[PDB]
Structure formats: structure tokens, C-alpha cells
Amino acid sequence: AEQSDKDVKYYTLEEIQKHKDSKSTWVILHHKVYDLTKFLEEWPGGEEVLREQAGGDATENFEDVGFSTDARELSKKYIIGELHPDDRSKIAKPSETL
């Protein structure tokens, strides 16, 4: 009920690496995870381009596959939680993501 996830949700990068669906789509800037599954429904309407690399990056990457310069603030408002400090560094060089 009132765990840490009630405030800020604890994600693994490993979870996001299993990206073969539109709802299984998130991006990480460093140590926080963003809800990219809502973000794909906004402008591009095609998960495939950003879902293939869900969990790769957010910092500059949300603008690559997502929107124009809009993609900066539009992803930041979709903050879903934090990515685990060990997982972001574990799969820091992701094979089936980039």
C-alpha cells in the first residue's frame, strides 16, 4: 500500500529489456524511469520505433524516436518512477535495445 513505490516506483532495466509490446515500453535518463508507453500514443502512434530500444536512454533519445524539442518536457511529465541504481549500470550497454 504505502511502500516507496507509492511515491516513486522501483523499476529494473531487466523488466524494460523484455520490450515486445506497446505497454512494455519505458526509457531511463540515468536513474529514473519514464512511461514511454503513454508517450508513443501521443504523437508517433507507432511503438515499434522506440519500443525496440525501450530502456536505452531518455536524456537525448526521447527526441530521436519521439517528438521534436517538445519530447524533452513531454517525457519529463511522464515520470513513472526510478530505475534501480544497480540495473541501470548492469545493462548499461544493452544488446537487444541500443
Curated annotation (Swiss-Prot):
Function of the molecule: Cytochrome b5 is a membrane-bound hemoprotein functioning as an electron carrier for several membrane-bound oxygenases.
Whole sequence portion shown: 2 to 99 of 134
GO biological-process terms attached to the record: response to cadmium ion
Similarity-based family: Belongs to the cytochrome b5 family.
Primary location group: endoplasmic reticulum
One MF term in the entry's GO annotations: heme binding
UniProt source species: Rattus norvegicus (Rat)
Membrane topology: Single-pass membrane protein
Modification N-acetylalanine, positions: A1
Domain Cytochrome b5 heme-binding, chain residue ranges per copy: 8-84
Residue sites binding heme per the record: W43, F67
Residue list for modification N6-acetyllysine: K6, K9, K18
Subcellular location(s) per record: Endoplasmic reticulum membrane; Microsome membrane
Swiss-Prot/TrEMBL keywords: Acetylation, Electron transport, Endoplasmic reticulum, Heme, Iron, Membrane, Metal-binding, Microsome, Transmembrane, Transmembrane helix, Transport
GO cellular component terms given for this protein: endoplasmic reticulum; endoplasmic reticulum membrane; intracellular membrane-bounded organelle; membrane
Name assigned to this protein: Cytochrome b5
